[PDB]
A paper describes a structure:
The LTA primase LtaPLm initiates LTA synthesis by transferring the first glycerolphosphate (GroP) subunit onto the glycolipid anchor and the LTA synthase LtaSLm extends the polymer by the repeated addition of GroP subunits to the tip of the growing chain. Regardless of whether LTA synthase or primase, LtaS-type enzymes, have the same overall architecture. They are composed of an N-terminal domain with five transmembrane helices, which is followed by an extracellular C-terminal domain (eLtaS) containing the catalytic site (recently reviewed in Ref.
Next, co-crystallization and soaking experiments were performed with GroP, the hydrolysis product of the lipid substrate PG, and the structure was solved from crystals containing 11 molecules in the asymmetric unit. Using this approach, extra electron density was observed in each monomer within the catalytic site. Similar as in the apo-structure, it was possible to build a phosphate group into a density extending from Thr-307. The phosphate oxygen binds to two structurally conserved water molecules, Trp-360, His-422, and a Mg2+ ion that is in turn further coordinated by Glu-263, Asp-481, and His-482. Additional difference electron density was observed in each monomer at the entrance of the catalytic pocket, into which a GroP molecule could be built. In all chains, the phosphate group of the GroP molecule in this second site formed hydrogen bonds with residues Ser-486, Asn-488, and His-489. In eight molecules in the asymmetric unit an additional hydrogen bond was observed between the terminal hydroxyl group of GroP and a water molecule (W1), which in turn forms a hydrogen bond with Tyr-483. The distance between the phosphorylated Thr and the terminal hydroxyl group of the GroP2 molecule bound at the entrance of the catalytic pocket is ∼6.3 Å, which is compatible with the length of one intervening GroP molecule. Our modeling showed that a GroP could fit in the intervening space suggesting that the growing PGP LTA chain could be bound in a similar manner during the catalytic cycle of eLtaSLm. Expression of the S486A/N488A/H489A variant (LtaSAAA) did not restore LTA production, revealing an essential function of the second GroP binding site for LTA production.
Numbering used by the authors: 227 to 644
Amino acid sequence: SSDVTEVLNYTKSKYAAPNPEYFGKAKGKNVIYIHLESFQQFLVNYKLNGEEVTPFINSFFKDQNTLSFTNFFHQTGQGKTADSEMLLENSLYGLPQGSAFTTKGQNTYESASAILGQQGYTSAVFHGNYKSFWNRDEIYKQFGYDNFFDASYYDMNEADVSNYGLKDKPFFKESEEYLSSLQQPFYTKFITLTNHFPYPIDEKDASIAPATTGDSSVDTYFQTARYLDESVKSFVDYLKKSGLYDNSVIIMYGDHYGISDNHEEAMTKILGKDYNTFENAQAQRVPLMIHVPGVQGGVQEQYGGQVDLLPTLLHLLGVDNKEYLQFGTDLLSKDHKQLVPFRNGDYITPTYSMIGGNMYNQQTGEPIATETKEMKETKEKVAKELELSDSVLQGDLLRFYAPDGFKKVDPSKYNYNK
Ligand SMILES: O=P([O-])([O-])OC[C@H](O)CO
Ligand SMILES: [Mg+2]
């Protein structure tokens, strides 16, 4: 009520207006999210022993129609993969502890699948694991996802299944039948899973040798990244052959880090510089590559986070999001602020960053002993933003508010069983 009012006053004052060069430039197009599991931005153009680890994704990165972000950060917490989903579908953060998917599965949401539903978009999630995991079966219905093609829809023979479920290559290949019979325009997300810690892979599935740092999970990380790269290349081939490549916004993104801060000696070797607390913060960059048919792309260096993605996508589709309780801003807008909150209260700006609660020069990596007024102000803005987002989840505030003309999801109308 007055909680709803405080949040909307905050979000509306933050709102960044669309860029006229990009607004609606993909109106009516399909959306295909390619979820790169545990994939960090440092992998892009990375060479292991003279050899590109992820060559197809590198080519996608540089494609003429691709908007490619080099300073884009994950903003997840203990909810991990489920947190990135909360961020992408709602422009809401996960919780400061535990998993929002687990505990807020019966909250009211006004998510991307619902917003695009208003305009006749069909929606679907594809995932090679069972719908019970991370409580997806429950919360997707509140999101208004028309479909959830989970492991029940796939051939889970033991040759094709890993320890998290179906491997990416048979997953993408068996998804084609389902995607091709989905009514267009559609809104879809493909959640991959082979690239999970500690990154095991059979020798015969591996086309690249492990790194040689002596840290097992860092060394085989490159091998599962390469395998994921190859599976994604096959998927895009299908998309080109089926004609979906030309009528869809295809978005590759990473959900969270692959290597933790507990592998400093190995990551020192991998990145060629001392992997200290600052560098570890810098390693929280994940890819964001938005391929838009007919629009000139280019490298995007403006700082941003996963919270900013839904406002960015909606503006590309020609949909205005000003009245929605969403905490991110359009990444292509000139009014987008280059400020990236972490879930623990840390933050990244192009000049100064707070990392582990301490201040650093973002350009040089040098510690700054004392917070200035400006650093303190930014810190409190970040704490305020996270608190208001938490107030939406903890207060279940979307019960009490929807933008005018928005029609709400009836979650009882969805069933994902075969
Ligand atoms: O134990 P580590 O290597 O720090 O990290 C392990 C992963 O974060 C758990 O999935
Ligand atoms: Mg993940």
